Amino acid sequence: MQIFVXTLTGKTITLEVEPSDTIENVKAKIQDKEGIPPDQQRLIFAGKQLEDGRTLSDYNIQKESTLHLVLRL
Amino acid sequence: MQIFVKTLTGKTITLEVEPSDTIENVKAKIQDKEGIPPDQQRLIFAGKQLEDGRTLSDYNIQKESTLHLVLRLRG
Ligand SMILES: [Zn+2]
Ligand SMILES: [Zn+2]
Ligand SMILES: [Zn+2]
Ligand SMILES: [Zn+2]
Ligand SMILES: [Zn+2]
Ligand SMILES: [Zn+2]
Ligand SMILES: [Zn+2]
Ligand SMILES: [Zn+2]
């Protein structure tokens, strides 16, 4: 599958994805990919701030979908 | 005095402000509570989008009032 994560400076990074993959799970993927601890990032989708332990599907995300997400701190 | 902000999350969050607190001042508070840089938040009250450098009072805001919130998404 594949979803996009956008940052602050526009840098657009792709992710492999899990369909019912939790948000905790996505944060770990960003870390595996660009090394920012999950406890630092916050993801937003279509205005809403996603919370870990809810799944991509719980928020109706689909392949080709865009998570800004983006960013955190 | 207290004021209320509607988060992206949606869980209401609470702030300790003063009457003559500027808006860039409020963002900094939000940054402190939810690690979101000011330069990314945009606040709205009662329909209007508040601009930094104007004060809570210049927008007629009082106790227990609420401001919803959202991200600028500049790029
Ligand atoms: Zn840590
Ligand atoms: Zn978390
Ligand atoms: Zn968007
Ligand atoms: Zn569920
Ligand atoms: Zn004071
Ligand atoms: Zn502080
Ligand atoms: Zn600003
Ligand atoms: Zn003024």
Numbering used by the authors:
A (entry chain A): 1 to 73
B (entry chain B): 1 to 75
What did the published study say regarding this structure?
Ub itself has seven lysines (Lys6, Lys11, Lys27, Lys29, Lys33, Lys48 and Lys63) that can accept another Ub molecule.
In order to unequivocally demonstrate that the oxime conjugates accurately mirrored the structure of native isopeptide‐linked conjugates we solved a crystal structure of UbK62‐ox. The topology of UbK62‐ox accurately mirrored that of native UbK62 (backbone RMSD 1.1 Å). An important consideration with our strategy is that the oxime linkage could potentially form a mixture of cis and trans regioisomers, thereby giving rise to structural heterogeneity. However, we suspect that the steric bulk of the protein reactants ensures that the favoured regioisomer upon oxime ligation is the trans species.
